[PDB]
C-alpha cells in the first residue's frame, strides 16, 4: 500500500 504518516511509532 502506502506508508502511514506515523508508521515508525508502531513498528
Amino acid at each position, epitope marked *: 500500500k*502506502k*506508508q*502511514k*504518516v506515523h508508521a515508525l511509532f508502531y513498528k
Partner: antibody
Amino acid sequence: VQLVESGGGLVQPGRSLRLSCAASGFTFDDGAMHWVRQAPGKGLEWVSGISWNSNIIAYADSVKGRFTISRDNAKNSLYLEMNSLRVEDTALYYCAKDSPRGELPLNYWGQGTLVTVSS
Amino acid sequence: DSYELTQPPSVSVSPGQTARITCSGDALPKNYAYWYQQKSGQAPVLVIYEDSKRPSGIPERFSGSSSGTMATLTISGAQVEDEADYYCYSTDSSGNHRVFGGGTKLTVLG
C-alpha cells in the same frame, strides 16, 4: 477526553523551558503522542513524537539536539524539555495524540501553550 | 529547507460551489496524505485520513484523493462553516520527516 498543555513562557535565547501536557479520559492504548507548534499567523510544524511505551522517539530536524521528549503514563503526562532556545522557536505549542495504531494521526489536540523567546 | 508539501496560499469559493485544495509532494505516490481543518482561535481537526477516508463526524461533502505527486481535498457544496485554514500532512518514504503543507486559507465568500 482532554489534553491540557502548560509550561510555556517568556525566555531569552539560549535558555530553557519544560512543557507539560496532562491527559484525561484516555484508556491505555498504543497511541503515540506528539508536539506540534504554530507561530502566530503561520503554519503547523510537527516537533516531536513518542510511542506509547516511550521506546520510539523522533524529532524535527530543526530541533534535534536541543529538545527532549518524554512520557510518564503513570502521571498521564507528556513533556517537552526545550534547551538552547532560539527566537524562531517562538510559537503556540500543541500536544496531540493518535488513535490506536496511528490510524487517525493527531486525532486529539490540546489548546496550546505559548512559548516566547525574545532578547 | 526540508521535505516539502506545496499548497496554494488561498482558495475562495461561493456557497454551494465546489472547493478544491491541492497538495503537491514528491513522496505522495508512496505515502498517505492527511488533511486538517483549523478555524480561527481553534486547534486543528482531522478531516481526511489515508488519502480518501473520512473520520466519524465529518460531513460527506468532504472527500479526498491522491494521484501521482498531488493530493486533493474536495469540498462539494461548500458551506459557510467550512471557512478555515486547511493543511495537508504526510511523511517521506524514509520516515525521516513528517511535514505539513504551508496551509491554504479557504474563504467561503460572504
